[PDB]
Amino acid sequence: SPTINFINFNQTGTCISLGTSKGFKIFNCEPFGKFYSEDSGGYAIVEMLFSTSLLALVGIGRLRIINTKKHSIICEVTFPTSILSVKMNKSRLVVLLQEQIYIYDINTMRLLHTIETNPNPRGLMAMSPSVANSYLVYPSPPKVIKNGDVIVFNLETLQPTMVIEAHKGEIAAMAISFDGTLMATASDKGTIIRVFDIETGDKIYQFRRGTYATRIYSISFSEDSQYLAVTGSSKTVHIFKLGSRHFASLKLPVETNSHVMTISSIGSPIDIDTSEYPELEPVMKMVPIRVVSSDGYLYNFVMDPERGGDCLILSQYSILM
């Protein structure tokens, strides 16, 4: 049975990306189905555009970009050190190494600017997916107090904008709103979650997670920037309303192994019936929540945006089959 090394949604939450030890696979969420998969070789990093049949492909052990609808190679470039993580927009290319970060235009593929960054073995970044507010942020720890410094960078103008004293320690997890107005960061202790307004840098929401310090894997904003989701080694997913303590609680089933990396995302609100699902009026709106885990399973949840609390489990598909 194949193992899996990477999980990430698209920029909208309508697809599933994966690179396996024997290939890669891409999926869709609402009308569950299989688009594409190749059993070529091992891989490390996979990312997508807003669909458009373009893939970011990295070998497990260079960057290769492939058009799946064309089954052909668009371009290919080499880097000195091992690649760690990238994300995509409609106007720029962003790639990071442990001490270097590179930026390119998506269309013409030519290089634009190079920034020599401090060591980031974890390699956590955050970049807007919108053109008119294209902003990218990376941590700036001092070269071994002021440990939690982040740099606010504009891909349209290729210049730094502002510096924020976000956290007291090393940076752990970052995400940026769909419209690029908000950015949230995670400390190593994971007790304090802070999200800011990008243009002014003023802190707007300060959040408390859990009781004892646990690591934080990743976080993700919603399309309307109303809710934020957190994933950690406590196998528990907490959401925080952006409209303190956690608003509502997500609990993965017991049979799931604890040492799992899990990625979550938030979609547009939906209306569902109360008849088929014993939630405990025919229709009242529900917010869908999707969580895909590195153990190889998908889960569907529904969110009550007044009551909060535990969310009921609806259905679970099993990936790789």
Author numbering: 5 to 65, 74 to 156, 222 to 320, 409 to 445, 459 to 499
Quote from the publication.
Autophagy-related protein 18 (Atg18) participates in the elongation of early autophagosomal structures in concert with Atg2 and Atg9 complexes. Atg18 belongs to the protein family of β-propellers that bind polyphosphoinositides (PROPPIN). The corresponding primary structure contains a series of conserved WD40 repeats forming the 6 or 7 blades of a β-propeller fold. The autophagic membrane adapter Atg18 reveals an unexpected structural plasticity in multiple modes of oligomeric organization.
Using these preparations in high-salt buffer, we determined the single-particle cryo-EM structure of soluble Atg18-WT fractions. Due to the very small particle size, i.e., the Atg18 monomer corresponds to 55 kDa, we imaged over 1000 particles on a single cryo-micrograph. Classification analysis revealed separate views of single Atg18 displaying characteristic structural features of blade separation of the β-propeller. Alongside Atg18 monomer particles, we were also able to classify a selection of Atg18 dimers. Comparison with projections of the T and I-interface dimers extracted from atomic model of the Atg18 tube matched some of the 2D classes. Moreover, we failed to reconstruct coherent dimer 3D structures of these Atg18 dimers presumably due to higher flexibility in solution than observed in the helical assembly. Nevertheless, using monomeric class members we determined the 3D structure of Atg18-WT at 4.8 Å resolution according to the FSC 0.143 criterion. Next, we successfully docked a single refined atomic model taken from the helically assembled Atg18 into the density of monomeric Atg18-WT. In accordance with the helical assembly structure, three major loop regions were not resolved and disordered in monomeric Atg18. Together, the structure determination of soluble Atg18 supports the occurrence of monomers and dimers in agreement with the T and I-interfaces observed in the helically assembled lattice structures.
